[PDB]
């Protein structure tokens, strides 16, 4: 029922939201200094987990060009100065694994220890074209110093996206709800070009799905798919059962009984993946 959004739009919610979002983008500027600063910062980001589902719910029954949808995005120009930070924070730690993915940035210090010095990486990151000048040594200070001679990017890597695996997908959802909902508007278009990285990283984990509802008012809903069931649906244990039932929805099926068979098809396939994941290695 959209009757809550009559008062929640006109009253005093959204300046409180920008007052939360400023400190939300400003807390992890200093709570990345030391290794003892993360088990409470991840408490703050699974508060961000519900901060995004706060305004995910105002997209329910979303009129395409509605004043509620415009008052969703005048948020980010009343608070334009605290969104670039939270959009580039999910980019400065997610191209992190893309630094190691090239072999040219791997063979710098070929020591068998794994302690590459900080100065050997600073001038190396200054040579790439996907970086910012004054934004090198601050994330070096966010990394472990250890007398400025130890990086250990194996633990620089896997620790800072363990709380940024669940919030990054939903802020990608937040940027992709509004791109196709409100069209032809200038200043809500630049920041998806500035934050297309998490969208590109979550291209396999994103899905656009439509359900008819609320007396003929259809609007799209987004969902998440896990990496375990991602790479295993593309196997010939099931990709030919695909065509096995594709052949028989027009050969014998009618118009009124076509998806009544398809839902049993999906549950039988997820049943054989239940037993196949049991006997999997």
């Amino acid at each position: 029922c959209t009757g809550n959004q009559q008062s929640l739009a006109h009253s005093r919610l959204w300046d409180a939201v920008v007052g939360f979002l400023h400190v939300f983008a400003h807390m992890m500027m200093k709570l990345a200094q030391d290794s003892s600063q993360i088990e409470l910062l991840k408490e703050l980001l699974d508060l961000q987990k519900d901060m995004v589902v706060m305004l995910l719910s105002l997209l329910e029954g979303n009129v395409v060009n509605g004043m509620i949808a415009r008052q969703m995005v005048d948020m980010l120009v009343e608070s334009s100065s605290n969104v670039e930070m939270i959009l580039k924070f999910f980019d400065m730690f997610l191209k992190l694994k893309d630094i190691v993915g090239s072999e040219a940035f791997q063979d710098y210090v070929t020591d068998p220890r794994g302690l590459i010095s900080k100065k050997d990486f600073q001038k190396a990151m200054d040579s790439q074209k996907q970086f910012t000048g004054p934004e090198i040594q601050f994330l070096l200070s966010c990394s472990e110093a250890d007398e400025n001679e130890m990086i250990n990017f194996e633990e620089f890597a896997n620790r800072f996206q363990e709380p940024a695996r669940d919030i990054g997908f939903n802020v990608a959802v937040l940027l992709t709800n509004l791109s196709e909902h409100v069209p032809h508007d200038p200043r809500l278009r630049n920041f998806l070009e500035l934050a297309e990285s998490i969208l590109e990283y979550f291209r396999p984990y994103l899905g656009r799905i439509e359900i008819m509802g609320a007396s003929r008012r259809i609007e799209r809903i987004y969902f998440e798919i896990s990496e375990t069931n991602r790479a295993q649906w593309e196997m010939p244990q099931v990709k030919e059962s695909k065509r096995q039932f594709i052949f028989d929805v027009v050969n014998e099926g009618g118009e009124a009984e076509k998806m009544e068979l398809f839902v049993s098809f999906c549950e039988d396939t997820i049943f054989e993946m239940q037993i196949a994941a049991q006997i999997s290695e």
Partner: peptide, 28 residues
Amino acid sequence: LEEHNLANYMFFLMYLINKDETEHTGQE
């Protein structure tokens, strides 16, 4: 490939089974 896809709807049927329905929304 993305909107009217055959695999993403059975993924949508998948992900609503494991977690609890004290998490699901009005449309979910």
